[PDB]
Each structure stands twice: as structure tokens, then as C-alpha cells.
């Protein structure tokens, strides 16, 4: 009957704050495969794409292990996570019939493998250790590269191609879009992605049906990219029960981060130093310079749909700031 | 040997004869001519690079290159190289470009097309290469020939940098970097643009020499020189040229072959049951290579006036070829 209670868990999947840490344990730490199975029934993806179920949960499992089990933060909750938080801002009712059925696959798919193989540390230290993965990237979107090159690899494994039937004009546009979707979520290119954002609300045209008007390719992969980017950096929009977990695994994978840091003689990472970090201000930090920015211009731009969600997060922000003082 | 010595004199020479330095240097043209530019410029002592580890480096760096592409091989690398060095000694940019910056130009040269197979971008993002899998289809060739160029460092006594400091080491990648993505032909269009932009804001002395203040200017120069320099061959005189010409066409031709027996488009100039060489060199030279050296001749005015000459007396020359 944990199954049933699975399910039962799973109903929640178009809601923001949707249990993923029960969901994780509920599903036998298949997470990520369980929430984009659903979703996938949810939005009809296996019948518009002709994707087998056998191979589309072969391919998630394979994904899902690929995942370091090891890591606090960037690890296959954290990927179920994003998706879950994409499949809901996709169905946004600003955004509702503006993007293709292969336009939503894309943002889904990449949300799913857009950390896969992540070691738990940062570009910045990868590049500092003289790691393999920065001498075969040339330092640049070091992990986000990675992620890409080993979600599509896998597509390549024994029943694993749920693209098999999409058409080849069909796979070319997807691939395009999936590569510029995670390499948007380097957060080296936050400040240009979220003055772009800016731009288009301030500019920004809505048809005779009150939708969004997306009218070119660079406009649409914006906002996708955009909206995955958002789901990425959304822990602290979360009910605080969820984000409070979040805020424990990420300052854990930064503390082992600054440990490694530390033994090497490196410069300690900011928010790295268990001997001097403060987890509260750090949060406070991160929603202010950060996360509140880019959500509150996210939210202009589908006002008002993200209204709740700007609420909880900034309720959440006076929480953290609360235990300061 | 003492013939080899005689044609290296040439080093600072537009026209060297690096097909002659190839086969008198027992096919290491890359190694002997990166080692008479690093003396003639000093670069050994002033970066305390140990010769024998120069050596070790420029021979392992060379066999990385392969013996059985016509056209992007090692003594390729060798002329951009050569052709580079001489840019670089341009009267408008004296005083231009520090140590540091000169030995990033050289370096990033000779590395920038280490282990090419012969075939496109194109071609490796349309055949699902395990490449383009690895590159997710951007710039393919440029970052592997990096990732290439700077693994070999790491081999048994190649570390040519172990005596620069860490940030002389971390600013000296950075260029690199920034000067071999810049060679990917897909961005050919835009570092032309900035070219441009700089020659309408070009700020200079009285002596007719460029002043570049800002790094951002200076590795767009670097950018779009190391770019003339692989794009260099119809500036050449003629009897060089039309052996490149050879290379190119040959290479091309064989990536169509292979389109061909798997079944794609048939990229430009690479089906040789329509292609027609001459017309082709005409077309690059007038919507590429022109624009590329009219725009740089602008910007180092004149002083590349003979070079300009020469690409357009070759131009003529394979129009008149054509019936
Ligand atoms: C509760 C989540 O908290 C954070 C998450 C992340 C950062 C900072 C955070 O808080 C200080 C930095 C960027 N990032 C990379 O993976 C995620
Ligand atoms: C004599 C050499 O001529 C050529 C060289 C190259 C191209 C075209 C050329 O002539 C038609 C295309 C771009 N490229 C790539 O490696 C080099
Ligand atoms: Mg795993
Ligand atoms: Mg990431
Ligand atoms: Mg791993
Ligand atoms: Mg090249
Ligand atoms: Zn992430
Ligand atoms: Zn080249």
C-alpha cells in the first residue's frame, strides 16, 4: 500500500510546494522518475511523442543513477524538483497554448537532466583544482556542458532513445533548445539572463486571449530559458518546511566545498567556511541580490499568476531576517 | 640542416617557405619554426622556459597533429604560427601587446587546430560524433583542439609554463582560450563587426601607432589577428597559395566523399563532381579574405599595403583562370 500512498502523493503534482523529500522516500529514491512519469501522463507526452513506456522509464532510471546519491543538494530530489517546479510554471495561465508540444518536452527535459553527474562542487573550484572537467571545457559553463553532454549520452543506452520517433527536424529543434535551456542556468550568466527579463516585461505584448505574444525563436527560448532558471533557484519560494531542507543540503555541500578549499591552502569560497558563515544572513542574502529579483521580474512578466509565490517567498525572507536579531 | 638554417632567416618574412622548412626539417616544420620564434623574440628567457621541455612539448604537440589530412596538419600549424609572428611585429602595434599577451598569440597558434580530423563542424554536429556529444554542438573542433593542446602540457617534461607564476599562468589560459574559440569560422562575421568598430574609433599617436587601453579591445585584436594569420594562404605569394589551395580542396573533397557514401547535404565546395577550385578561391577572397584584410589593413594603416597587394594580385590571378 505504499504505492497507493505514493499516489495519492503524486495528485499534488501541479501544485507549488508539492512534498518532494516524501515523494523521494515514498517512491524508493526514484523521485525524479516517478514526477516525470506523472507528468508525462499529465500533459500526454507519451502518446503526442509515441514514446514507449518501457523505454521512457528506462531512460529515467538510467538519468536518475547518474545522479550523485552522495551529494546533499545537487543530487536526483533536487532534479525532480526543478522539473516539478517547470511542469508548474509552464501551466501558467499567461502562458497557456504559447508554447509548441515540443517546446514544453524541451523545458521538461532539460529541467530533468539539467545537474546530472554533478560532484557537488562548484565551476569556480573546478577550474581553481585544475579539475579533468575544466580542461575539457576550457573553463567555460564547466558543469552545465557536463550535464548536457551526459543527458544525451544516455539517450544512447540500451532502450533509452524516448526520442525514437520524433522526427529528425523534430530532434534537431529539440536538441538546440535543451542546450540553450542548461547552459542558461549557469549562474555566471544570471545578471545578462535577468536583465533580458527585465527588457521583455518592460516591452512586453499580450494577444487578444491575455496570453504572452512570443513571436520569434529568441524571444520564446528567453523565456523558457528564463523559466527553468527560475525553477532552479526557487527553494526559497517554497513552503519553509521544504526550504529549510534545502538551505541544510546546499550549506552542507558548501561546507564540504570550503573543507576541500581549506586542506588545499585555497581561498575559502563565499558561504564555504563552517567556521564562519552565517546560514541566516547568507539566505537573506541570496533572496535579496538574487532570488527575489529574479522572481519579482518573472512574476511581472505573468502578473498576476505568480502573486502567491512572491508572497510565500517574501514571507519567507522576513522569517530568515527574523532570526538575526 | 644548413639549408633548413638558411630558409629559417626568413622567419620574420611574409612568404617563408614553410613547405620547403617541412620537408628539410624531416616533417617537424611546427617544432623548429615555434622554436626560432621563441628565440628571435626572446620568450625562453623572459618566461625562464627550459629548451629541452620546449622541445619535448612542440614534438609531442606535432604528432598530435595528423600526417593524413591534406590541409589542417601540422605544417598548417606552422605557417598561422609564422604568419602570426609577423603580424604581431606590424609597426601600427608597436607597444601594443605585453610579454604575456605576444606569448598567448604564439602559443594559442600553434595549438589551434591540434588533432583536427579533416571535417567540419558541420559535418561532426550532423553525424552525431561523439564530439559534437561531448561539445553540445558549439564551436566542436576549437574547444577540442584547447582541451588538447593544454592536456599535452601535462605530459613527462612538457610543461613549457612551470616557471610562469599562478597568475601569469591563469591570464596566459584565459587568452588562449578566448584567441582559438575566436578561429571558428561561425564567428567570422562577428569579430569582423568589432574589427570594424575599432577602425571607425580607432585611437592613435602621432607616429601612426594604436592605442588599446582596454583588455577587451586588445584580445579582439589578438582575436581577429590569429584569424587573418589562418586565413592568411591568398595573401601569400602565389607558388604558396595555390599548394594550399591543393590541401583545402583535397580535404574538402574527401568530406564529401563522405556525405556522399552516408547520404548528406554535400557541404559547399566539397562535391568534386561540381566543384570548381578557382571559382571558389575568387568567392572566398571576395566575400571573406578581402573584407577581413581590407578592414585589418585599415586598422594597422598602411602598413598592410603589401600584403593587401599580393591578395589581390593573387585574386586576379585565379579569375584569369577562369575561362
Ligand atoms: C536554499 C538554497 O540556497 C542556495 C542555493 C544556491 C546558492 C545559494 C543558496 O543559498 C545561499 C548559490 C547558487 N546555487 C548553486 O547550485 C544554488
Ligand atoms: C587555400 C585555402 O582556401 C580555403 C581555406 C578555408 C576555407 C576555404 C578556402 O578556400 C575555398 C573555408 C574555411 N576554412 C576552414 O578550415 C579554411
Ligand atoms: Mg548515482
Ligand atoms: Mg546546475
Ligand atoms: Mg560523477
Ligand atoms: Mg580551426
Ligand atoms: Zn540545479
Ligand atoms: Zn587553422
Not at 157 to 165: G, L
Not at 255 to 258: A, S
Not at 306 to 312: E, S, V, W, Y
Given at each position: 500500500?505504499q504505492e497507493?500512498?505514493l499516489?495519492?502523493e503524486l495528485e499534488?503534482?501541479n501544485?507549488?510546494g508539492?512534498?518532494?523529500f516524501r515523494?523521494?522516500?515514498?517512491?524508493?529514491?526514484?523521485p525524479?522518475?516517478?514526477?516525470?512519469?506523472?507528468?508525462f501522463?499529465?500533459?500526454?507526452?507519451?502518446?503526442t511523442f509515441?514514446?514507449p513506456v518501457?523505454?521512457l522509464?528506462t531512460?529515467?532510471?538510467?538519468?536518475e543513477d547518474?545522479?550523485?546519491?552522495?551529494?546533499?543538494?545537487?543530487?536526483?530530489?533536487?532534479?525532480?524538483?526543478?522539473?516539478?517546479?517547470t511542469h508548474?510554471?509552464?501551466?501558467?495561465?499567461?502562458?497557456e497554448?504559447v508554447?509548441?508540444?515540443?517546446?514544453?518536452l524541451?523545458?521538461?527535459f532539460?529541467s530533468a537532466?539539467?545537474d546530472?553527474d554533478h560532484?557537488?562542487?562548484?565551476?569556480?573550484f573546478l577550474?581553481?583544482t585544475?579539475?579533468?572537467?575544466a580542461?575539457?571545457?576550457?573553463d567555460?559553463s564547466?558543469l552545465?556542458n557536463?550535464?548536457?553532454?551526459?543527458?544525451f549520452?544516455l539517450?544512447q543506452?540500451?532502450?533509452?532513445?524516448?526520442?525514437?520517433?520524433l522526427?529528425?527536424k523534430?530532434?534537431?529543434?529539440?536538441r538546440?533548445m535543451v542546450?540553450?535551456?542548461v547552459?542558461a542556468?549557469?549562474?555566471?550568466?544570471?545578471?545578462?539572463?535577468?536583465?533580458?527579463?527585465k527588457t521583455?516585461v518592460?516591452t512586453?505584448?499580450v494577444?487578444?486571449?491575455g496570453?504572452?505574444?512570443?513571436?520569434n525563436?529568441?524571444?520564446?527560448?528567453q523565456?523558457?530559458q528564463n523559466?527553468?532558471?527560475?525553477?532552479?533557484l526557487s527553494n526559497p519560494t517554497?513552503p519553509?518546511?521544504?526550504?529549510?531542507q534545502?538551505t541544510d543540503?546546499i550549506?552542507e555541500?558548501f561546507?564540504?566545498?570550503?573543507d576541500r578549499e581549506?586542506?588545499?591552502?585555497?581561498?575559502?569560497?563565499?558561504?564555504?567556511?563552517?567556521?564562519?558563515?552565517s546560514v541566516?544572513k547568507?539566505q537573506?542574502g541570496?533572496i535579496?541580490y538574487?532570488v527575489?529579483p529574479?522572481w519579482?521580474?518573472?512574476?511581472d512578466?505573468?502578473?498576476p499568476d505568480?502573486?502567491?509565490?512572491?508572497?510565500?517567498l517574501?514571507?519567507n525572507?522576513?522569517w530568515?531576517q527574523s532570526?538575526?536579531?
Open positions: 500500500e497507493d500512498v499516489a495519492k499534488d503534482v501544485k507549488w508539492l512534498h518532494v515523494i523521494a522516500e515514498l517512491s524508493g529514491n526514484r525524479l522518475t516517478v514526477i516525470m512519469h506523472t507528468i501522463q499529465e500533459r500526454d507526452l507519451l502518446k509515441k514514446i518501457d523505454t522509464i531512460y529515467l532510471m538510467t538519468l547518474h545522479y550523485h546519491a552522495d551529494v546533499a543538494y545537487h543530487n536526483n530530489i533536487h532534479a525532480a524538483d526543478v522539473v516539478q517546479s508548474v510554471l509552464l501551466s501558467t495561465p499567461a502562458l497554448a508554447f509548441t508540444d515540443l517546446e514544453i524541451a523545458a521538461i532539460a537532466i539539467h546530472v560532484p557537488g562542487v562548484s565551476n569556480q577550474i581553481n585544475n579539475s579533468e572537467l580542461l575539457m571545457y576550457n567555460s564547466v552545465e557536463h550535464h548536457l553532454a551526459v543527458g549520452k539517450l543506452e540500451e532502450n533509452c532513445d524516448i526520442f525514437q520517433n522526427t529528425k523534430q530532434r534537431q529543434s529539440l538546440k542546450i540553450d535551456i547552459l542556468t549557469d549562474m555566471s550568466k544570471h545578471m545578462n539572463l535577468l536583465a533580458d527579463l521583455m518592460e512586453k505584448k494577444t487578444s486571449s496570453v504572452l505574444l512570443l513571436d525563436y529568441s524571444d520564446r527560448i523565456v523558457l523559466m527553468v532558471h527560475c525553477a532552479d517554497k519553509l518546511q521544504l526550504y529549510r534545502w543540503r550549506m555541500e561546507f564540504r566545498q570550503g581549506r586542506e588545499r591552502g585555497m581561498e575559502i569560497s563565499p558561504m564555504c567556511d563552517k567556521h564562519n558563515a541566516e547568507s537573506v541570496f535579496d538574487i527575489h529574479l519579482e521580474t518573472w512574476a512578466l505573468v502578473h505568480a502573486q502567491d509565490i512572491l508572497d510565500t517574501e514571507d525572507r522576513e530568515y532570526t538575526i536579531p
